[PDB]
């Protein structure tokens, strides 16, 4: 709801422990800090035709930064969300890093 943005934002990391057990205890750690746009999805983005869902989508662009999606919970303009993802860079020059990610689950949590 932000559409073009850029401010100092914190990204951090929640594991559910750094071995072959992805459960049992929880530890805590902070990634970086950048000049950032990370966005929710809303709906499908685009629109154009409706349909409905709980949002578990995020967009996001943060030059050369490949850090946002790929497994981390950051803390975006004050909200604190958990997801997965892929990183993808715009080209050219190599500038902007174009990062889409999503959350799902792991079993109970």
């Known amino acids: 709801m932000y559409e073009e943005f850029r401010d100092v934002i914190t990204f951090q ?27 929710p999805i809303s709906q499908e983005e685009y629109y154009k035709a409706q349909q409905l869902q709980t949002p578990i989508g995020y967009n996001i662009y943060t030059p050369y930064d490949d850090r946002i999606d790929k497994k981390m919970r950051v803390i975006y303009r004050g909200k604190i969300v958990t997801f997965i993802g892929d990183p993808v860079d715009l080209s050219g020059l190599q500038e902007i890093t174009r990062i889409k990610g999503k959350e799902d689950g792991a079993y109970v949590g």
Do not use: I, M
């Open 13 to 39: 990391s929640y594991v559910e422990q750094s071995n072959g057990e992805g459960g049992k205890t929880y530890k805590w750690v902070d990634e970086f800090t950048a000049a950032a746009h990370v966005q």
